[PDB]
Structure formats: C-alpha cells, structure tokens
C-alpha cells in the first residue's frame, strides 16, 4: 500500500559529500520509522541509523560518526542521509526501510560510487548469429561495453520478452564496465518480427535502442 | 554490538525437504527478524519476532528460538525459495545483521546451451573485437570455458560473468567475452567457445570462421 522512492544513483569525488533521499508515498502511519542500511559488494549489510519522521529522535551507530548525518523535511516526511567525506570504502548501495509495527516496506536502494572517473556510456553492440546453426529456439545478445558508471539496465522489446532474458552481472576492467544479456526465442518469432535490445544508463541520461539484425 | 553469526553460509536443499539455518547472537535478545534477498532486489522482512511471517510469506516459513540462538525453517524447499537470508537484531544500538545463508536448490542435471558471437561490424570499426560465448541454463553450477583461436587455447583478456541461481527453473548461466583488438582479430580466421561440463563426457564446441 505505500511505496518508498528513493534518489537515483549516484558518482562523487573522493572527499566531496552527497544527499541523497527516501520519500514515501501517500499514508496515514504516524509512529513509523525510517531505517537507512548500507549493502556492500552486493553482500553484507550495515545499519547505519534511523529517524521518526513524526517526530522521533534519532538513532544513530557510532561506526560512521562524522560519514552519516541523517535528518527528515517535515513538510513532506522525506527522509535524508548526507554521507560526508567521501571515499571508496563508501561505495555502496544504500537502502531506505519504514517499519510500522508488522509491515515494513523498503526502497529500490541508491547505488553510490566514489571515484575520479567521469560518466562514459556504453557502446551498445547487438549480438546476431554467425554463419547459422538452426534449432528449435535462437539466441540474441547485447553487448553493453565500456561504461561507467553502474547501474545499467537492459530491457529487451520493452518488456515484452523476459522469460528467456539472461542479463549478466556487470565486470570491471581497467576503470571501465562491461556486460551482456542474452535472449532466446523461437526461430519462427526473429528475424520475422523484431527484437531489440533497451540499455539504460542514468549516468548519461541515455536510453539506446538496438534492434538486432540477422548477419 | 551484538554481533550474530550465521550458519550455514552456503548450502544446497533438496527440493521437497525440510530446510533450517541458523543466527547465534553474541548476547540474549528477546526477539529475532529475518530477511529474504532474492537476486537484483532490495532485502524484505520475511519473518518478524522470532516467529511471525510478514505479508505475503508461504505457510512452508517458520521461525524458531530464544536467547541466543534462533532458526529460520522451510518445511518443503521450493525452487522460488532461492535466496539470500539475513537475520537481524534490534537490541543494542547499534541494530546489526548477519552475514547472510545464501540458499540454493537441488535438481536434474541440464547441459548447458552453448551460443557463439562474432564481433559487431559497429564495434570493429572502434579498433576492438569482442567475440561473445553464452553458456545458458546449466546445472551443477560448476563449469569451465575455454577459448581456441586457429585451434590455440587463449587464456589472457576474457571476462567471465555468471548468475545466481534462477528462480523459476534453478538453472546458471554464464558470459565469456574475448576482447582482441580488431587487427588480431582479422590476422585469425576460426574463433572456437568450448564448455567443459559434467553433462558430458566430451565438451560442447561452438566455433565460427571470420567470413
Ligand atoms: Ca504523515
């Protein structure tokens, strides 16, 4: 019934600071809290404090003392953490939870990268067979390469295909990222109707198309 | 801090059979949460106090427990119940978390489905020459891929990435990228992706010639 937006991602200097924000859609909770948890390397996770938007104190956790300052508009209940002096132990996605009493309800997360590198967008190259192979099913790709930095995202017809989608985890590689996602359909579905990759990377405010063409 | 340790870290279920995992606390607490991390979402509160289940969560879900020992039970494991679980405590401050069971789940042995990519003429004209090898819907999860170029085992600029466990038919798969520069690439003529798997005796050999 209620859904937490959060910020979008985000790449920061070493050193500089970043706000980034949970607003919580339309409610009537009033002794609610909002918790903010820090997951790194898609793995562990850390509670770095919390906030009673309708007038709480603060929880804090004393391990990131001058990193984290979290505070709430009253205006809008939305809720911000400020990370403060910035490095690359910092790198993280950082989630948002409301907790009220036995619901809980948590935000997408904002992935936060630390680093001198600027925004490059990815090449986006379309993976269509070689020479043949013939089956029953064919298998498409779309080769995302060079990019920084994370997250894409990779649709594949809008949306329309999904259940035979494999996107693969993002490698880095001197400084840059790579991935791939691959797609099977029945032989008598592509080149006879289109398929097309859809790559995002909010970085670069870039939404490609690729449709993919036999060779 | 109460610190909480999990066991197991890893583990592999039987579908069908009873599943339990653990959280050990450092000091007693009065209650216990637990968390599902399912690949490419946010954690979710699964079980709360110990012994709840929050909305939405199948009746096969259990917790159990007290003092410093708690569990997190599945009474029949099911394919969709692949997943990372957290437990949590909220009784010191600061609040903390466990390193996480990372579950997984048992089934037939699939080959996997092997596709080769020549490069792109859009990426060739840039001086690179990725050739893609997908190597999709496989099971056990352990696999290797080697690369031949003119029948010659390449080992140096490969990028390999592969996926949890699916959902739905708890499969793996997995990418290979061999980067060349496109000079190299067009001093070869045959490109060869094999797969070395349990599923067969020999490897699965997908290859094309540069034509
Ligand atoms: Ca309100």
């Known amino acids: 019934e209620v859904q937490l937006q959060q910020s979008g991602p985000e790449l920061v200097k070493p050193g500089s600071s970043v706000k980034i924000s949970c607003k919580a859609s339309?409610?009537?909770?009033?002794?609610?809290?909002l918790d903010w948890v820090k997951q790194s390397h898609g793995k562990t996770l850390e509670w770095i404090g919390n906030?009673?938007?309708?007038?709480?104190?603060?929880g804090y956790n004393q391990k990131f003392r001058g990193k984290a300052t979290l505070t709430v508009d009253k205006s809008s209940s939305t809720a911000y953490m400020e990370l403060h002096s910035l490095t690359s132990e910092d790198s993280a996605v950082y989630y948002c939870?409301?907790?009220?009493?036995?619901?809980?309800?948590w935000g997408q997360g904002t992935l936060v990268t630390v680093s001198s590198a600027k925004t490059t967008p990815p090449s986006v190259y379309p993976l269509a067979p070689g020479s043949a192979a013939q089956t029953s099913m064919v298998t498409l790709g779309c080769l995302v390469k060079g990019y920084f930095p994370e997250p894409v995202t990779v649709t594949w017809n809008s949306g329309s295909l999904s259940s035979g989608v494999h996107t693969f985890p993002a490698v880095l590689q001197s400084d840059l990222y790579t991935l791939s996602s691959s797609v099977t359909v029945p032989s008598s579905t592509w080149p006879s109707q289109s398929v097309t990759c859809n790559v995002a990377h909010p970085a670069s405010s870039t939404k490609v198309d690729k449709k993919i063409t036999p060779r | 801090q109460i610190v909480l340790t999990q066991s197991p870290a890893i583990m592999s279920a039987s579908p069908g059979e009873k599943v339990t995992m653990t959280c050990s606390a450092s000091?007693?607490?009065?209650?216990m949460h637990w968390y599902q991390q399912k690949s490419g979402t946010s954690p979710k509160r699964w079980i709360y106090?110990?012994?709840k289940l929050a909305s939405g969560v199948p009746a096969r879900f259990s917790g159990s427990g007290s003092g410093t020992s708690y569990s997190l039970t599945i009474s029949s494991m099911e394919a969709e119940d692949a997943a990372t679980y957290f437990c949590?405590?909220?009784?010191?401050?600061?609040?903390?978390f466990g390193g996480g069971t990372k579950l997984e789940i048992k089934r037939a042995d699939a080959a996997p489905t092997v596709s080769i990519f020549p490069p792109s003429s859009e990426q060739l004209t840039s001086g690179g020459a990725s050739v893609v090898c997908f190597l999709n819907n496989f099971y056990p999860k352990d696999i290797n891929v080697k690369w031949k170029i003119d029948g010659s085992e390449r080992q140096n600029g490969v990028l390999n990435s592969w996926t949890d466990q699916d959902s739905k038919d708890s499969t793996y798969s997995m990418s290979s990228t061999l980067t060349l520069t496109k000079d190299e690439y067009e001093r070869h003529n045959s490109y060869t992706c094999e797969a070395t798997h349990k599923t067969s005796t020999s490897p699965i050999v997908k290859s094309f010639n540069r034509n």
């Open positions: 906030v009673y938007p309708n007038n709480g104190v603060t």
């Open positions: 339309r409610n009537t909770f009033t002794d609610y809290n």
């Open positions: 106090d110990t012994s």
């Open positions: 000091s007693s607490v009065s209650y």
């Open positions: 949590h405590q909220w009784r010191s401050n600061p609040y903390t």
């Open positions: 939870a409301l907790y009220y009493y036995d619901v809980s309800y």
